[model samples]
Target: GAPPIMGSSVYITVELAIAVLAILGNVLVCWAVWLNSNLQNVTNYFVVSLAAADILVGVLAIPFAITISTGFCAACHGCLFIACFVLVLAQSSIFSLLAIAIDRYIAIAIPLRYNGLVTGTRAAGIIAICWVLSFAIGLTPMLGWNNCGQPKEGKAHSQGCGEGQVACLFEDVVPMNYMVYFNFFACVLVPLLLMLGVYLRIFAAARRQLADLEDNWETLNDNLKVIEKADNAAQVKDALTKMRAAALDAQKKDFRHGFDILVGQIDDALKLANEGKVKEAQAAAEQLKTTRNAYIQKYLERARSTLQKEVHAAKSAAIIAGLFALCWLPLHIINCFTFFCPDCSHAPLWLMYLAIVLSHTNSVVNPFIYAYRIREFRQTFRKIIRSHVL
Candidate 1:
């Protein structure tokens, strides 16, 4: 006799707004990302994947609400599962953000090895893993763990529903509760803690490095000016040229050493492979990759440590953490009521619905934030957009 709480609340209105914003926002993100070949880094790839998940959620989940609102049952169970899965996909965007933060941390801590350690391939691998894990968790409900065996009492219709609609029976509170907690752990808590730890260390290191760079730069500039305006021009010019040449040679030597290490690593991998010890050789290769990652992380750490402020990495992590918290916190809080009240009040159910809507908003907003916030991302996006239009 009563109107469905989720279908007729301010929560739904907010959800609609969030959905619209997310669709437009993610479309822009996808467009910008697609345009830029250079922005095809592992991090942006993860972001794109996140946007995709959100886009599907918007397309699949919300329309069902309209049906429920009219009190007419059109069992779109397949869409329901996809909607749930997409929420998991949406949650995984946070994991991608975490991966990005880790990459940044390594870059800042070990600038010399950053490129090698976090190569585009590595990023792709990590993104792939995140999706696999998310899908595993998301699809658990469909495995009949939370058996909707016969749909909620009066709601059951055995006559003509497909296996797809029958699957909707499992969309009960138990699965919802388990999924909520799992998402919080997998997406929210772990990432927040990791990013926080990374930024704290990164910021401290950057400040120190920046101070040192300033001192070195100032000295280099002053020395160059003095050399240029020396009392004995010929002597000054000769000495300056020699000093520059020596410095360049020293830089070359450093590069050579790093390169030699890299070559040695590759040689080892080849030798291991040649010996016909397939698994062992693979293990050796894995070890080398790990070492390379560590090496890069060290350089990035040192580089960031030298900076006056760890603004780039820190700010990125902050925005990421902030967005995740803002969008999903409401739904989580509303869901919390389910434990005590069993059946949520109309207000809380509405808020829970809004949370879902707002959560999808992240898909759209993330790309713009990423582009405006990260120098590389911005440049890539600009290049992509420019190339496309021009």
Candidate 2:
């Protein structure tokens, strides 16, 4: 009998919602990265790869939703083929993330070597390798190397199959050997562990670099202060020297005036006595001397005033390192905890659902984070937005 469709089911509806959002979000990301010339960077190549992989996931969701709607048998070739595609996309996404981590680690660890080490050609090659490796692994199940042998129907478990039950009916041909081990280790555990280790090292290196930068800044500040102090002292000394020179000049002018007045007074006294006007000459000579004294006092006051006016009175990079961590850390931790903790099986279904949502949120939020956080990406995004608006 043809199984009833579950189009109205909560599971199918959720999958459909995920599909729509993921497609829209990932497509925009890919477009932004590709179209914006400034976003053409070695680091961002990995980012684009990650987006492409996620787009595959979104693409996978449509068929998955359809499979659920049609009540497809889990053991059917179509279902297994779709599962294979899911594995490929999921693996590629993880590897892309790993690539990003490695790129950042090298950048932070040895910034000088970054340009030399992570070139466009090399990055493209690495991305190509990631996809190839993912394809190789994804194709294994269909190639009869997985739990299911030859993908044939009767050889696998299809006896307990029911309408809504879409469980994998393919049991492991080689139970706990390389296939299962690789699935658990290479696909999941190893990636997590490797990323964790790489990120930790990156974090430590970033902190050291930041500390060194702060030290350099402090040293520069201190040197600037010293230079400022020296400049102020030189200014004050210059002002004092000018004041002293002005005072000396005033004193010399005053002496010259007094000498000239005395000389003229003596000469006039002699002339007046010769012309029989001795008393008037003496009175005139005394008055001229007094005028000279007054002139000298005025000149000294002017010098003092000039000197008074001269008074001087002196008055992420680690963030880039942590951006992905910030976006994906909580989800990763929650997922690992839930997966490993047997007691968590009894936990609320909503909690599990929330974890899944949070994990997908990484995909939707990653491009936005890159746009906002990176200078080049931000500039390009701004330009693109402005172009559309204008």
Candidate 3:
């Protein structure tokens, strides 16, 4: 008599497609991480772990979901076990995202001594604890946080809620109290909020650092007349040539225009010296020389130590959280609606079921995001594929 939310042809295709991609794509990620050794790092830990969660969602969570949706759990006592398993897998991806944010904050905060402090070995413990807590929260129902045979209810669920041998559903096994308060608020929403908070601090701090860098090199206008501080004209011209090449590499409009104007005027200075404006000409040449030295000191660093990778990272981290909210939040908000408005007509069973499949959509999409944004994933992924396929 149940609406065939699970058996709908549309959802069958949707969940099955997601399951395949999640398995195949994340398997590639896990294999790339393991084989490359280059991918093994403090940061890859969280990403790899997220990949791990997605992989398990295919092997376990999706299959278990199909079982429940098809009413395979109706006469079985395994409803809570399957329910707890799905919760454990779902809790993990969010934790991995939070850990990724924390990794970024650590990388930004202590960049100088970061490798010394947060090595690959040290990160293992943190990641381990994160998964451990995921299991604990998810399996709380199995530890008697459930209403299987409560004395107050005065009876147990028939075969763990098949009172008339009807289909065993998720709402029957996992209490709404647990979903709303314990899972949604404590586990999901709060950690996501913390990630956003940490991301704010990361943005502000990196901007401050960028501001200082921009100031030292960019604020050279006063020296457009400081002839006394000039370097030798020959060395200044050499520096200017190198500076132009790399400044273009950096693509800085302000400094490039400044360099160009002054370079043209260095000749203007020479032409004036040879003609009638000798003193001001020398002044122009010498003043511009001083600017070259200043520009060289800062902008000539075309090489890399750290050119605000965290700026990319923070935004990428923000993006993951945003996608996460888009996918996972629907279920939570709708669950709240169902709980708070218990008397109101419930959300359409189809949208409710679609939301569940939609949550798995995150697992399928993450590999694409990682391929685009992760520092080395695409190249390394290609290398792994190419090397193997060869």
Candidate 4:
């Protein structure tokens, strides 16, 4: 018999296609940045690492997911492989993003020593560690550590299928649950806290630097005003040019290479939050928004400014992060509730099934954010297409 249709096949096909594209797109990004020497920086290197993990997820997990969605867990009789693949992809994405957050903290918070701190080699080593760690976590479930594996099926004392369905299916159930919680905390919360702390330091340091610049500008501006109002045309012209340069410097300082630094930090922060690091991610984002607004206001107050207004977007981003937490929170909670409160009544089985399916959507949304918000990624993508087409 054919696999059951829990969801519209067309919808599943579309989602699957999107997931596949996301993985491929991220893989290409990894290659583009890693292969190009000019793109090899502390920032881009982490980006490449993140893309690699996401790509693996799409390649290894999503296909099996489609199969599982169509039928019971026993659909292909390769349930163990499917379970392992999805776990690795999902967990690896979390850890890879955690690494990115730390990379950003080092780059922006300790700009002077970033070169010594995180090199390309170090990035590669970190990526290796993330994969190794993911593999270890993924295997735990197979060992029955979490006891969450689907109940085994099939008749016969080890039919033609294979050896007697390898020992206990729930080998290490409780341990796996603990592992999942630890993975979420270490990969999400810890990195986010560090990022937040570093950004607070960066914000304070930047303010001090800007204050010195402003004081110098103020003294110089007064000297220039006196020179201009005086009768000496030559002296006034020199003063005006010098004043212009100082004002330009001050403006640059206010914006503070706003695009490069903010985007990198935000990308890492958002990535961590999407992986279930709610409070920690929010802490970093709140700090980033506060610092960004303070800089704009403290320096550009006399003039009309828009940076403060942009904090809305940061809040909206936080809301989006909250949505991910809400989505996955139920899955773990419901499962636990089901176990502990067996006598308590919940909705029908299908309703519970629907919630699981919806929660699964979180894995599909992260790449969409990059495609939507990141300009450089889009531009590089366009460049690649133009190359291939022309």
Best by lDDT: 3
- Which should have the higher TM-score, number 3 or number 4? 3
Query: Model 2 over residues 163-282: C-alpha lDDT tens digits?
Result: 433444322222233333565465756776787788678666655644543453343234323322333334323322332343333333555765455345545544554565534544
20-64, model 1: which lDDT tens digit per residue?
A: 776766776777677767667655776777777667656655554
Candidate 1 residue 217 C-alpha distance from true site, Å: 9.7
Candidate 2 TM-score versus the reference? 0.56
lDDT of model 2 at position 123: 90
Question: Candidate 2's error at 256, in angstroms?
Answer: 56
**Across residues 228-330, which tens digit of lDDT does each residue of candidate 3 receive?**
3544554334433443444444343545665565556555654454455434555566666556666544443531236455578678767877898899889
**Highest TM-score model number:** 3
lDDT (CA) for every model shown? 0.57, 0.55, 0.72, 0.53
**Cand. 3 Cα-lDDT:** 0.72
- Model 2's lDDT to the true fold? 0.55
Task: Judge candidate 1 at residue 56 and give its lDDT.
Answer: 62
Clashes of each: 25, 2, 1, 8
The collision pairs in model 3 are: 162-165
Candidate 4 per-residue lDDT over residues 195-236, each given as its tens digit: 455445544554565565657557444644454244433444
TM-scores for candidates 1 onward, in order: 0.62, 0.56, 0.75, 0.57
Model 1 TM: 0.62
lDDT of candidate 2 at residue 336, scale 0 to 100: 49
